Design a protein around this ligand. Structure first.
Ligand SMILES: *[Se]c1ccccc1C(=O)NCc1ccc(Cl)cc1
Ligand SMILES: *[Se]c1ccccc1C(=O)NCc1ccc(Cl)cc1
Ligand SMILES: [Zn+2]
Ligand SMILES: [Zn+2]
Ligand SMILES: [Zn+2]
Lengths: 153, 153
């Protein structure tokens, strides 16, 4: 019943369309779509706090973290609301995104609408990388593409 | 105390940053910023319903119209919520945007977050143009630049 969309673009060749759908307010959000122009392997995939693209992906700020928790993977209890883990690109540089998440929402306090979806340079280590940066950003590095998360038909 | 932003980009050289700020949920929204690469004169300036830029500005859909009213100018009681009238570009193609609106909001049912801001090819006639199209789109024509309205710091 609620649908939102995000068009990912950046400075490089990284570009994608990501769809979100939530059938009930207390329910999981299905996240699906395609990103191309990635290097083979894992790329960190986060909702960032600000829907602000004024100076590219950098104005999106840190991980969307309304509950003031530490960084984790999508399937940890200890995670930022915006922690969607990694998408995986093949030798062709295509990541086929198919995620179900119960922590993000398309309504209420956990609502991601008007925030930024970012795909990262490197792998999110999901907070288990063994430095301080792991429990903040997960060491996923630079922002390759982003977009503001918007209300869909 | 609520701040949102929108980066306008399109198929052409039209580009802009537009800021929105609302001190209280019951209060007016101040809208300000700059757009460049416009032709001299009036350009229709609307919040459209969907924050969907999957196929450029066209996927934004019609005027944000949660109350099912006819098109008007910002000063009319009969207006779409998204009816922000016109911005005016000079010989230099720059529009200095300075608007105060009491109908848009950054919270509640009239909330523009996650919707699309669009600047148009032509003048919005503010519903007084004397055809049926005036009461729907205001005859402002093509979409030159748009962006999704996002949460700011
Ligand atoms: Se998303 C969200 C978070 C917190 C409070 C309210 C809301 C919300 O309901 N947003 C407005 C809206 C309107 C239509 C659609 Cl399809 C989605 C969201
Ligand atoms: Se107002 C609104 C419209 C569409 C989607 C969500 C919302 C919303 O209320 N989100 C909660 C919110 C809004 C602004 C800020 Cl700064 C924080 C949280
Ligand atoms: Zn990130
Ligand atoms: Zn995080
Ligand atoms: Zn209208």
């Amino acid at each position: 019943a609620t649908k939102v969309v995000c068009v990912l673009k950046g400075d490089g060749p990284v570009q994608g369309i990501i769809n979100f759908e939530q059938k009930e307010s207390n329910g999981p959000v299905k996240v699906w779509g395609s990103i191309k122009g990635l290097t083979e392997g894992l790329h960190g995939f986060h909702v960032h706090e600000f829907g602000d693209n004024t100076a590219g992906c950098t104005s999106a700020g840190p991980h969307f973290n309304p509950l003031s928790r530490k960084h984790g993977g999508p399937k940890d209890e200890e995670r930022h609301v915006g922690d969607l883990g990694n998408v995986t690109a093949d030798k062709d540089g295509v990541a086929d995104v198919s995620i179900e998440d119960s922590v993000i929402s398309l309504s209420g306090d956990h609502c991601i609408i008007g925030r930024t979806l970012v795909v990262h340079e490197k792998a999110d280590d999901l907070g288990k990388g063994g430095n301080e940066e792991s429990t903040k950003t997960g060491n996923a590095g630079s922002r390759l593409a982003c977009g503001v998360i918007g209300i869909a038909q």
